[PDB]
C-alpha cells in the first residue's frame with residue numbers, strides 16, 4: 001500500500017499514450033554551456049527575440065499566423081492514405097511484433113499493440129495534413145516510424 | 158360564438174376545407190378514430206350484458222398548398238388555428254352520422270428559425286409558433302380543473318349549471334369572466350353540488366431546460382414553463398429528451414396594471430409533445446415496422462445460418478470474438494421473465510462479465526451496445542456519485558415537501574446497463590447489485606420511504622486483471638479479484654487473452670487498415686419484433702440436454718477450473734430461450750440447448 | 763506539431779468512431795521544459 005497511484009499506473013502510461021518520451025541526459029559539460037549561453041541570450045539582450053523577428057523576415061511563422069494556419073488546415077482537410085503507403089506499416093508491425101516477443105519470451109516483463117499501430121496511422125496522416133494534402137505516401141510514413149521508434153527505445157529503457 | 162363570424166374567419170374555414178378535401182389522409186384518420194371508439198362502445202355496450210381527439214398535421218402539406226396560410230399558423234396562430242379546428246369539428250360531424258365535444262390539432266416537421274433551443278427562445282416572436290428541444294426537468298402533480306359546475310335546487314328538483322373560461326382555453330385574450338361559484342339560486346334557494354355531473358380536465362405544467370450536449374458548456378441552464386391540457390399529461394417524465402411545439406404566450410399584466418420590476422409571465426401552450434431518443438435516455442428507440450420490414454424478417458427466420466452472420470455483423474470494427482458477441486446479441490433478446498402464480502417472479506435478464514488483457518475491446522464494445530441497444534444507460538461505476546446507479550436522495554422545498562428521483566438502473570427498467578471499470582466500483586454498489594441480480598427488486602428504508610421499486614434490467618460488466626496482465630499459466634481465480642458470489646451472480650464470465658503471438662496477429666494489420674480505409678438498422682427492428690411477439694415455451698427435445706450438461710459439469714468442473722451452481726442451471730434455459738427467439742421459434746428446440754452448451758464450453762475452458 | 767493537426771476522425775457506419783487526436787506523454791526529472799512546453803501550446807492551440 002502507498003499514497004497516490006499504484007503500479008497499475010504502469011498500464012495507463014504504456015497502453016493509452018500514443019508516444020511516451022523519456023528525456024534525461026547527464027550534465028554534459030558542453031551541453032550545460034550551450035543551453036546556458038542560449039538561456040542568457042533569452043533573459044536580456046533579447047537576441048532570440050531579435051533572431052525570431054529576423055527569422056520572421058527569414059523563414060519562421062509568427063505565433064498568431066501559425067495558429068490561424070493550424071485552424072485552417074485542421075478544418076479544411078479530411079485526409080486519407082493510399083494502400084501503397086499502407087503496406088509499409090504491416091511490414092513494420094509484423095517485424096516489431098515478431099522481434100520483441102523474444103524479450104518477453106526472456107520474461108523481461110518490460111507494449112507492442114494495435115493501440116500503437118493505430119497511433120502511427122494518425123501521426124503519419126497528421127504529418128501529411130500539415131502539407132494541405134488529401135493523401136499520404138511513404139514520403140511521410142518513413143519519418144513517422146523514425147519518430148515512433150524514439151518512443152520504443154524509451155519503453156524498453 | 159355569440160358574435161357574428163366575419164369573412165376573415167369564414168374564409169379561413171372554407172380554405173382549410175379545400176386542403177382536407179385534397180389530402181384525404183386526415184379525413185379518413187379522424188374517421189378511423191370514431192371507428193375505434195364505437196367498436197369499444199359496442200364492446201362495452203354489447204358484451205357486458207378512447208383516443209384523445211387530436212391529429213398531427215404535416216406542415217410540408219401546407220407550404221406547397223397555401224403559402225399565406227403557412228405564414229399564418231407560424232406568425233399568427235391565434236387567428237388561424239381556432240378556425241382550422243372549427244373546420245375539423247364540422248368535418249368530424251360530416252364523417253359521422255350516427256347519433257350525437259371538441260376536436261384539436263397538432264403539427265410536425267420543420268419550422269426554420271422558429272425551431273430554437275430555450276437558450277435563444279427570447280421575447281422576440283412571442284406569439285409565433287415555436288419548437289423547443291431539451292430535458293423535461295420536473296413535472297407538476299396532475300391536478301383536476303373545473304370547467305362545468307352543476308347544482309341542484311331541491312325546492313324544485315331543477316338542475317342548474319355554470320361554465321368557466323380562463324387564460325389557457327383560448328389563444329386570443331377573451332374578455333375575462335370572473336364568474337362566482339353558485340352557492341345560492343337566483344330565486345334565493347339553497348343548493349347542493351352534483352359532483353361527477355360536473356366535468357373536469359387535467360392541468361399540468363412541465364419545465365424544459367436546454368439539452369446539455371448542445372449547450373455552450375460552462376453556462377447556467379435556462380428553462381421555460383410548458384402547460385399541458387388533458388391529453389399529453391401522461392407522456393412526459395423528468396430527465397427524458399423532449400421536443401415540444403406550441404404558442405409562446407406572454408400573459409397577464411404585471412406592473413402596468415395593479416401596482417409595483419419584473420415583466421410578463423411567459424410560457425408555452427403545448428399543442429404537440431414528443432419524446433425522442435438520445436444516448437443514455439429513459440426511452441427506447443422504437444422504430445416503426447412496415448408490412449414490408451416484417452417480410453424481410455420472415456424470409457430470414459427459417460434460414461439455418463442467421464445466428465452466425467447476425468453475431469458477426471454487430472461489430473466489424475473489431476476482429477474475432479464471435480464466440481462472445483454471440484452472447485451479447487443474446488442479452489438483447491433475453492429470456493421470458495416468467496412470473497409465477499401466487500409466487501415470486503423468476504429472472505429473465507442475462508448478465509455478462511467481460512475481462513481480459515487491457516489491450517482488448519472491453520471499453521469499446523460497449524459503445525456498440527450503448528449506440529444500438531433498444532434502451533441503454535452507461536455508468537463508470539466509480540463516479541456514480543449518488544446512492545449509486547439505483548437509488549437517490551429525497552427532499553423537497555415545493556408545496557408537497559417530499560419528492561423521489563430514480564437512479565440509472567431504476568430508469569433502465571427493462572433494457573441494458575453498460576458497466577465498465579467494474580472492479581473500481583466499490584462494495585457499496587456491489588452488495589446492492591447482489592440485491593438486484595436475481596431478485597430484480599430494490600429496497601430502501603430512509604426516514605420517510607420504506608418501499609420496493611423494480612429494476613428488471615440487464616448488465617454488461619467490464620473489468621481488468623488487478624496484476625495489470627494475466628496469462629493462463631497463472632492460477633485463474635485470483636486474477637478475477639471479486640467476491641465469489643459476484644462470480645456466480647454474473648452468468649457468463651469470458652476471459653480474453655493477448656499473450657502476444659504472430660500468426661493470428663499477422664492478419665490484424667490489413668483488417669485495421671481496411672477498417673480505416675446484416676446491417677445495424679435492421680437489427681433493432683429484428684430484435685423488437687422478436688422481443689414483442691415471441692415467447693418460447695420449452696420442449697422436451699431440449700429439456701434433457703440442460704440436465705445432461707449441467708449434471709456433468711458438477712462432476713467435472715468441481716474437479717477443474719470453475720465453480721458450478723444451481724444458478725447456472727437457469728442460465729442454460731435463458732440462453733436456449735434466447736436462441737429460439739433468434740429463430741422466432743414458437744417453441745424451444747434441441748439445437749438451442751447445444752448452442753447454450755457451446756457458449757459455456759468457450760466461456761469455461 | 764503532429765498533435766495540433768488532429769487526425770483520422772472516422773465515423774464508421776456502426777457508429778464506433780475512432781479518435782483522430784493523439785496523446786503524448788512527457789517524462790523525466792524536472793527541468794528540461796517538460797512543464798514549459800505545455801505553456802506555449804496553451805498560446806498557439808485553438809481552445810487550449
Ligand SMILES: Nc1ncnc2c1ncn2[C@@H]1O[C@H](COP(=O)(O)OP(=O)(O)O)[C@@H](O)[C@H]1O
Nearest residue numbers: 118474475476515516517518519520521522780
Ligand atoms: N480485438 C480488437 N480489434 C480491433 N481493435 C481493437 C481490438 N481490441 C482493442 N482494439 C482497439 O482499442 C481501441 C479501443 O480501446 P480499448 O482497447 O477497447 O480500451 P479498453 O482496454 O479500456 O477496452 C480501438 O481503437 C481499437 O482499435
Ligand SMILES: Nc1ncnc2c1ncn2[C@@H]1O[C@H](COP(=O)(O)OP(=O)(O)O)[C@@H](O)[C@H]1O
Nearest residue numbers: 035038039042791792793794795796797798799
Ligand atoms: N530546454 C530548455 N531551454 C530553456 N530553458 C529551460 C529548458 N529546460 C528547462 N528550462 C528552464 O526551466 C524552467 C522551467 O521549469 P520546468 O522544467 O517547466 O519545470 P518542471 O521541471 O516542473 O517541468 C524555466 O525557467 C527554464 O528557464
